[PDB]
Design a protein around this nucleic acid. Sequence first.
RNA 1: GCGAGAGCUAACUUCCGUAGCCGAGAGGGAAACAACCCAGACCAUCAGCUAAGGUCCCUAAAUGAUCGCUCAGUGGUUAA
RNA 2: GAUGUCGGCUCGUCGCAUCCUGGGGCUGAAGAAGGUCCCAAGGGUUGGGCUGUUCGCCCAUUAAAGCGGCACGCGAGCUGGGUUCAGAACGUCGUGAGACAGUUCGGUCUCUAUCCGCUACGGGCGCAGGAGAAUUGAGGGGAGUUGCUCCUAGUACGAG
RNA 3: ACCGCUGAAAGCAUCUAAGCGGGAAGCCAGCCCCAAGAUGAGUUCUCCCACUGUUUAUCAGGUAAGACUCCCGGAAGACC
Lengths: 171, 205, 37, 142
Amino acid sequence: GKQPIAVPSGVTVNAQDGVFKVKGPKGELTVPYNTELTVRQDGDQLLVERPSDAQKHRALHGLTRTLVANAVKGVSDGYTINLELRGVGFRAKLTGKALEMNIGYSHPVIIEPPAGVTFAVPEPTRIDVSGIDKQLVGQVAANVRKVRKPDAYHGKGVRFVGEQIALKAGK
Amino acid sequence: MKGILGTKIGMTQIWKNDRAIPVTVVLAGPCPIVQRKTAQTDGYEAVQIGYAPKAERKVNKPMQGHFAKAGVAPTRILREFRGFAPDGDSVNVDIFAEGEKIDATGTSKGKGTQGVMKRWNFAGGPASHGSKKWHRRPGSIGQRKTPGRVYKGKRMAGHMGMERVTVQNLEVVEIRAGENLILVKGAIPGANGGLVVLRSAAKAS
Amino acid sequence: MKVRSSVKKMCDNCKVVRRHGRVLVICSNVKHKQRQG
Amino acid sequence: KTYIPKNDEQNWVVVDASGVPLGRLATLIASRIRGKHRPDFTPNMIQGDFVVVINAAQVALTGKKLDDKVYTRYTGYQGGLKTETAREALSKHPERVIEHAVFGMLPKGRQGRAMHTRLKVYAGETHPHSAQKPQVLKTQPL
RNA sequence: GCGAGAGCUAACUUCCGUAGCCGAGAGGGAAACAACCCAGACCAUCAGCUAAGGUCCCUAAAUGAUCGCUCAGUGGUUAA
RNA sequence: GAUGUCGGCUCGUCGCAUCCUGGGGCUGAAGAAGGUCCCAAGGGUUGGGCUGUUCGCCCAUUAAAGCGGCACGCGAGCUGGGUUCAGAACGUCGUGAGACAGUUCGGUCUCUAUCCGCUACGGGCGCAGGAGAAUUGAGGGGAGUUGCUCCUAGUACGAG
RNA sequence: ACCGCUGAAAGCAUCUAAGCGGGAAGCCAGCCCCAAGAUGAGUUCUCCCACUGUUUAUCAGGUAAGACUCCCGGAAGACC
Ligand SMILES: [Mg+2]
Ligand SMILES: [Mg+2]
Ligand SMILES: [Mg+2]
Ligand SMILES: [Mg+2]
Ligand SMILES: [Mg+2]
Ligand SMILES: [Mg+2]
């Protein structure tokens, strides 16, 4: 099951009607869910109650609770993905708000991020994707991962810093 | 979009640097702007232009009114151009540039009733190993009991030519403003002395 | 992808997860990938 | 012996399509168009009301709008003259979705065809008020 | 249809047995439709009740009542 | 009281269980070349020699030289080589007249389209006055193929 | 087809159960041509303008703007 919700300092859940709105210090992040299931603050912490116990209600339960915790941990501290480029000559740079990679292809790949999401590069062979919504950061990083998937023979490509890859090796 | 009306003059042979170029001469004469179509008034954006002059006697009362409103001179040819809103009264100078790719349109020369061999590039048949169907004649019009009909659209003998034809991406070889002329590389459709519609490349490369 | 009309359990790593009304299989080993269309 | 009619009346109705399941809405319109409660109650002629539909774009469809609801409309000699469109894809013509569901539940003869003149569909709310200089007696579905 | 042979426990197949219909049988139903389902037309009526079948609109009559199921348009193309 | 029968030609269109080209997954996928399965029917799918041949074999190319349906699609569209008329021959069978599992040479393919259908083209009337002209686009049709070379780069990869 | 993000049922895991992204010579649109008989017959500009006729001939008849007829021709065409 899914039941306890930790809500530190700047939390302001205004869950009126179907719009289960969450305002905080790290901008205003809204999240929509079912009205058939109950959700409100019980003094200090939060709780998401379910009515029926068949299966359709059970499935939406664990999902609704994780998503609110995600939106809570979001406006609290934030979300940040650490990506690592690998292979000879592979490198990334910054052109204003856009990320520019030079990863083996004849032309250089450019990625302009959507709203609320920010690109960052410490050393040119490392990418950092940071923003509000977990999904948008999840996607944007996956699009960067898509630019070059690590191959089964050398692992050349975009990987998750401390990511483990199995190596087939032919010749 | 940015277009004009002219007359096909002829074809000549011309050189640019060391290479010969077949050219179609177009007199893209001055075009009075006679009606401005606005979304506010007509429901779409366009310009009604005019072409060859008409003697005032030859012009009927309703057309006189239409011209007098814009205060022009009566024409004979009137065409619209969508999304082209110029100022003044339309001439090729500054409209077309030497080198610019254009879309020449006209009415093909009409060849009247033409049978399947000329009209559709058929094949006809044997000229000798026993025939009654010697060259032109289509073959089978259909199949058997099944679509006991003949396919709609079936390529057949009919009136060939005298249709609207647009020729895409033609080079603007030379321009002689004042002479109101424009040299175009290649062949524009229709006969000499015919109406032509030169415009911006429909979708350029 | 080995499109077998009879997808069965091969080893303790295959996870039978349905997709758009069809039986699909997601596993760690690339050869183990089984589908029905 | 049995009673026959007149025509001095031509009732105009204003049904709202908003959130009503398509066929469920359709039924109401087709019945009010033919002669449901019927003035003099006769079938040799049109006793029906002039239904005016509003909020066509906001109409409801169940499990599948994306899948299943496909409007097959096959053109001239079918030399692959087979055209099909999803109900979602009818964002082009919301008015033809209601129109070509209601005609589907109407008689099909000389008279039946005459009856599609009575239905007047619009996607808007305040903008349909075009054919709204005669009567505007609003009747809800159920 | 049921009971068998022949046939591939094929055929709108063939050859018997047995019942019913069509043949010679109109009317309702089964979209349409000899045979299936209901039912055997003496004539007239701008009367009434029912059968099989039905009661969202095309199309007569509950968009009926109650407790459930399925979410695949299954319903409204068969198996290991 | 007759639904002309093989092949060719002509003319097409359609299924996809896809020959090419497009997108993918797995590979005993290093790369390059493949294998195999999935999605996909938009277009494309060469010219000859032999045979009546369809088929098939060969020559020379190709991205590829797909398999099927449409009365083994199409003879009121053409051919008439094959088969199934009358002559004649050979082999064979029959005492014979004749005959075939055959083989061979020859052997008339019927000017006028009424309806539907199809291609073009007009006349009528409608579109709430009689007219000249410019038009929006609901809808519909056409089109849709592909190689090779260079650059990236002698880079990635590979011991080479 | 396929690859993925967020992610429960199943305290993990999962591209799915609710949601979201990407993805084909195919789909719709774009390109060229027809197209308001689109009887649902659309829009815009301009012109002419309210003529005459006894309850004995209940709408015909002069006319406007405009066109046709005829003639001479045509890179239009069988004829139109
Ligand atoms: Mg020839
Ligand atoms: Mg025939
Ligand atoms: Mg069984
Ligand atoms: Mg025969
Ligand atoms: Mg491939
Ligand atoms: Mg996309």
